[PDB]
Symmetry: C2
Subunit: 251 residues, 2 copies
Amino acid sequence: TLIVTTILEEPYVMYRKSDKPLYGNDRFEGYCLDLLKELSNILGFLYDVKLVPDGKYGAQNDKGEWNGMVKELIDHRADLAVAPLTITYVREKVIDFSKPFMTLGISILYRKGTPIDSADDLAKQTKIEYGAVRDGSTMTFFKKSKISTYEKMWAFMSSRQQSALVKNSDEGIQRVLTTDYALLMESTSIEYVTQRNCNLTQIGGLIDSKGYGVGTPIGSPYRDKITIAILQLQEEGKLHMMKEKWWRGCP
Amino acid sequence: TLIVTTILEEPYVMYRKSDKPLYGNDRFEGYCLDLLKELSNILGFLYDVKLVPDGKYGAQNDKGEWNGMVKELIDHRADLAVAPLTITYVREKVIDFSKPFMTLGISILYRKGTPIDSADDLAKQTKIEYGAVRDGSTMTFFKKSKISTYEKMWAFMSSRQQSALVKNSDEGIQRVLTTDYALLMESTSIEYVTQRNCNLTQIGGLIDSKGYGVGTPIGSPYRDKITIAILQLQEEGKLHMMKEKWWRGNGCP
Ligand SMILES: O=C(O)c1ccccc1O[C@H]1CN[C@H](C(=O)O)C1
Ligand SMILES: O=C(O)c1ccccc1O[C@H]1CN[C@H](C(=O)O)C1
Ligand SMILES: [Cl-]
Ligand SMILES: [Cl-]
């Protein structure tokens, strides 16, 4: 029996709506749940789902200590990590990512019927406020980026004691829905919001490219099996059936 | 010093146009050449480029024997494989792919100003001929697919002794440019053709999703370092600079 760490995030992992209390893996539903069931079908294993204790994805502090699911894997406290976990330079040095089961990039969430079309328009303007979720991967991108426009936008974001940032995605969506605010976030979620908020839309394309990968500890025997299984589901179109299932309109 | 097997394909690996003979790595230019230089910058190694002898990518025959670059890596005849090599189920069981340095999918190459808009439009019709390169990965997808539309299209393609298929991509491009033909192929090439053939365009989106990865033999010490370096170039935007360099054309009206 394997242990699978994960985090709550629509529509990947959500508390299932039921009248009676639920127990174990039956407590959760979502894209990553279906993906985990298919993984258990291919590789043939039993799995127990455990939300990450501190509710964090995975970053390292100044002394080099990791948190969240990444740390769960490093300490051999979880066997798998099935969640929208971004494949980054620093994360892959400490854990093993499978081949990406979803490809995406940073984009812009804003209102419809406006003249804004790119991040350069946001950079050339200070009336509309723009920012991202604190400590998320997008913030890390703008922090580390050396592209001119993105260093300017990071200056605006960090400015005023980082007042332009939000603690979580839903607070950012609300800030867009109530003020003159643009929220830079991962595009797979922008699809969800836009498909469920017909007055919001994505502005521009993808600023970069990245992917969600299943995480395993370094030296795990299930590494190759997980990668091969992910590719097997990719070529069968199953992953796209799942995404289309959990994501589907707007005029 | 490492040995890197590869294959010729615009704009990944092309013979540079010169008046005088060229020698060694100076013979070649392209996207994968720039990527290989940056990789050598990160990991710090010397490399020698070797075109794959049989000029094949990598497939297995009826008895289970591999050819092309894949076989080059399996037999420890190459250290790296830097080429538009698709990360497939059957290939990863025998070699190690890095994280993809380019993501793409199967799409349709056709003419502009026509009513065709999706693979469903092609599937409902037998007047317009459509197909793909024989034994390639694009053909393999339609071979294995269990979706209704793609099983229908596979019937049309295989029909008439596979008369709808072509031997290579360039013959397919010519077939589109001269007859009423649609060529299903990897989208990264459709972008190149469309940028250099302003009367051709891509029809629809991506039928599937896949990626090009640097190939190494199983158990190579350069594996993790190559993957990490590829991700480092992804986060620096270098891969997009290279693609935009080798893909932008002179524009279309
Ligand atoms: O970071 C965001 O902007 C974001 C906005 C909405 C929803 C999810 C977001 O990212 C999460 C999931 N991937 C990031 C990681 O792998 O660390 C963190
Ligand atoms: O097959 C195609 O659609 C194609 C069209 C133009 C150029 C190259 C093409 O395929 C090569 C590259 N990817 C395939 C592989 O890595 O297995 C073989
Ligand atoms: Cl994908
Ligand atoms: Cl990429």
